[PDB]
Amino acid sequence: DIVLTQSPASLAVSLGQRATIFCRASETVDSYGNSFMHWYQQKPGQPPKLLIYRASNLESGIPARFSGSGSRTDFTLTINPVEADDVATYYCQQSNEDPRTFGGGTKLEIKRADAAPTVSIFPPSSEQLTSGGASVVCFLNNFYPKDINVKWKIDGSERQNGVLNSWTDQNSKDSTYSMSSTLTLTKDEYERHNSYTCEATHTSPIVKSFNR
C-alpha cells in the first residue's frame, strides 16, 4: 500500500503570499510517463473538490492561483496568491495502485491582525424554562487569534464545567474566528442564582453579564 505523508500539518500564511504544501509518497506513483497524484480542497460543510489531477494539471473551473508539480515520490501544491477564501484542508491522493489512499491533510490558515471579540449573552428562553431546563449561552464573535479563554461566573464565583465550548472554522471573508460557550444547569439551580457573567480573556477581559 502506498502511504502518503503531507507536510506541514497546518500552515499559516498572510494574504497575498505564496503557500506551498508538500506530499511524499512511500513509493513511486509514476507509470506510463505520468504521475498519479491528485490534490483536493475541502472546506467545512462542503464536499471535497478536485484541484489538480495527475500531479500538474489544473482542473477546469478551478482558479488559476492553484498549481501543482512533482514526480515519483515528491509532490507540491502551490496557492499563489493566497486569498481569504482559501481557508480549507488540502489533500493529496494517489491512484497508481489500488487500494487508493489519501494523505492526512494540511489545514491552511490565514495570518491576520489581532481582533477582540464581540460578545453576546443570552439567558434561558422561557420556552426552555417552561420545559424544565436552563442553558445560558455566550457568543464570542469575530476575534483573532483562535486561542481565547472563556470563563463563567455565577454570583461572582467561577463555574468551571457543565460548560461546552465550540469554535467555528476560520471565516472565509475576514479571517476571524468565533465561538459559542454554553452553560447548562437545572432550572432550579438557575433560579437559585442572580448574576450570570460570560468573560473572554486573551489582561483586560471582555465581559457580558445580566441579573435575574
Binding site: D1, S31, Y32, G33, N34, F36, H38, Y40, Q42, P44, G45, P47, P48, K49, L50, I52, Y53, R54, E59, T89, Y91, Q93, S95, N96, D98, P99, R100, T101, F102, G104, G105, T118, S120, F122, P124, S125, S126, E127, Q128, S131, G133, S135, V137, F139, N141, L164, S166, W167, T168, N171, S178, M179, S180, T182, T184
Partner: protein, 218 residues
C-alpha cells in the same frame, strides 16, 4: 447543472446493514469509474471502494473488504454502496465521486456528491429541541444585533440550521450525556430587527424533524 444526489444515510445498529445510493443529475456516469470515500468524525478522508465503468472491476479498502459491496446501474445513472456487518468506526459522512475518464492510466475524482451521514450505534433517535436566542425587549443595542438558535438533545449528529431574513456562524455539535447540542448565530443590522422577520430553520433528517423558530425579543 451538475449534481450527484446521495441518499440512504441513517442511524443503524452495530452488525446492521444499510444501502447508499448516488444518482447523477446533469452528468453521465457511463464511461467513467466511480468511488466511495468517507470522512470520519475526526475529519480525515478515507478511500472506501471503486468500480470500473461497466462494473467489471471492483476494489475495496482493507477496512471494508468482506463487508461492503460497491455496484452500479448505468441505465439508471446510479452508484450504490451496500453496507453490512456495520461497526462503530464505520460512522462517517459518505461521498460518492465520479472519476475523470482520461486515457493513459488512472484518474482523479472530478465530481463529488454532497455526502450522506451514517451513524452506527445502539442509541435511539431523539429529535432536537430548538430555543431562540434573542436580546430582551428593552435592551439597548447597536449597530448590529446578534441572534441565534440553540439546538439541544438530539441523536444522531446530522442536523442542518438555515437562517431566513448577514453573517452566519455555525458551531460544531458536542456530546452532552448521550445527546448532541449545537448553536448557530446570525448578525443583522439594529435597524432591521425586530421589525423585519428573522427565522432559523432546523432539520434533523434522522427523526424527520423540521423546526422553524421565529426570533422575537425577550
Amino acid at each position: 447543472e451538475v449534481q450527484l444526489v446521495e441518499s440512504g444515510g441513517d442511524l443503524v445498529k452495530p452488525g446492521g446493514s444499510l444501502k447508499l445510493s448516488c444518482a447523477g443529475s446533469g452528468i453521465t456516469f457511463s464511461g467513467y469509474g466511480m468511488s466511495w470515500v468517507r470522512q470520519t468524525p475526526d475529519k480525515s478522508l478515507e478511500w472506501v471502494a471503486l468500480i470500473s465503468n461497466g462494473g467489471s472491476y471492483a476494489y475495496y479498502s482493507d477496512s471494508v473488504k468482506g463487508r461492503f459491496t460497491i455496484s452500479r446501474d448505468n441505465a439508471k445513472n446510479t452508484l450504490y454502496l451496500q453496507m453490512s456487518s456495520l461497526r462503530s468506526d464505520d460512522t462517517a459522512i459518505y461521498y460518492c465521486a465520479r472519476h475523470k475518464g482520461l486515457r493513459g492510466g488512472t484518474n482523479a475524482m472530478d465530481y463529488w456528491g454532497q455526502g450522506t451521514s451514517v451513524t452506527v450505534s445502539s442509541a435511539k433517535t431523539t429529535p432536537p429541541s430548538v430555543y431562540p436566542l434573542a436580546p430582551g425587549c428593552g435592551d439597548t443595542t447597536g449597530s448590529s444585533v446578534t441572534l441565534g438558535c440553540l439546538v439541544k438533545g438530539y441523536f444522531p449528529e446530522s442536523v442542518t440550521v438555515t437562517w431566513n431574513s448577514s453573517s452566519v456562524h455555525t458551531f460544531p455539535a458536542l456530546l452532552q450525556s448521550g445527546l448532541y447540542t449545537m448553536s448557530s448565530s446570525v448578525t443583522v443590522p439594529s435597524s432591521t430587527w425586530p421589525s423585519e422577520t428573522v427565522t432559523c430553520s432546523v432539520a434533523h433528517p434522522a427523526s424527520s424533524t423540521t423546526v422553524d423558530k421565529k426570533l422575537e425579543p425577550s
